[PDB]
Design a binder for this molecule. Structure first.
Ligand SMILES: [NH3+]Cc1ccccc1
Ligand SMILES: [Ca+2]
Length: 223
């Protein structure tokens, strides 16, 4: 997250870290046994880390649970990043409380202008690299589809939306991928892609979760 603020320990209780020996992507806990992330975060041997703030210090509220199954969307295209969403089943149910909780799925799509919260452990610099150890947060609005398509001609599908600031300065970045965009208490987006981080006229692009609710619910019910 570039240009954000320190969330505070366990203030984003649905945020997960995907670990393969090291943090490599974010994710969101959507019930006791299932996590949603970005398909471009796929890899084998994932451990899901819940209750994290400092990802390099054991602070006492963590739950570390291995993945038993990963399901990439049937229509994920890695060249265009269309349908950039994946479901991960935990080997055992997590223990839910105030500091570790699920985020609700949307019933409706969110409209442009709605303010959302984006969070992650990704790079904090637009030029160069500095990775935080504690969770960072950013408040940002959903941009109109017209402005999003104007920023990225030819690249934006119905399954994507832009959020952020056309002036630059504030954005998600590498290492935030997979993580949540939450608006009015619902999961509306997944951190997916963009052209660099925090640049002028290049906002972040996010997977539009409202289009996938039926696939998520049917997949969870049969796996
Ligand atoms: N600035 C959007 C973004 C770029 C690369 C990875 C994740 C997010
Ligand atoms: Ca920790």
């Amino acid at each position: 997250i570039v240009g954000g603020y320190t969330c505070g320990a366990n203030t984003v209780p649905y945020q997960v870290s995907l670990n393969s020996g090291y943090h490599f992507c974010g994710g969101s806990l959507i019930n006791s046994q299932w996590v949603v992330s970005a398909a471009h975060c796929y890899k084998s041997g994932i451990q899901v880390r819940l209750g994290e703030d400092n990802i390099n210090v054991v602070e006492g509220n963590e739950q570390f649970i291995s993945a038993s199954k990963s399901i990439v969307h049937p229509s994920y295209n890695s060249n265009t990043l269309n349908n950039d969403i994946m479901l991960i089943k935990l080997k055992s149910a997590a223990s839910l409380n105030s500091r570790v909780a699920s985020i609700s799925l949307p019933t409706s799509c969110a409209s442009a202008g709605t303010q959302c919260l984006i969070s992650g452990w990704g790079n904090t610099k637009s030029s160069g690299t500095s990775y935080p150890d504690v969770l960072k947060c950013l408040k940002a609005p959903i941009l109109s589809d017209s402005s999003c398509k104007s920023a990225y001609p030819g690249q934006i599908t119905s399954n994507m939306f832009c959020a952020g600031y056309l002036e630059g300065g504030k954005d998600s970045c590498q290492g935030d991928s997979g993580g949540p965009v939450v608006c009015s208490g619902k999961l509306q987006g997944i951190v997916s892609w963009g052209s660099g981080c925090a640049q002028k006229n290049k906002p972040g692009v996010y997977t539009k979760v409202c289009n996938y609710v039926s696939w998520i619910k049917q997949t969870i019910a049969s796996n």
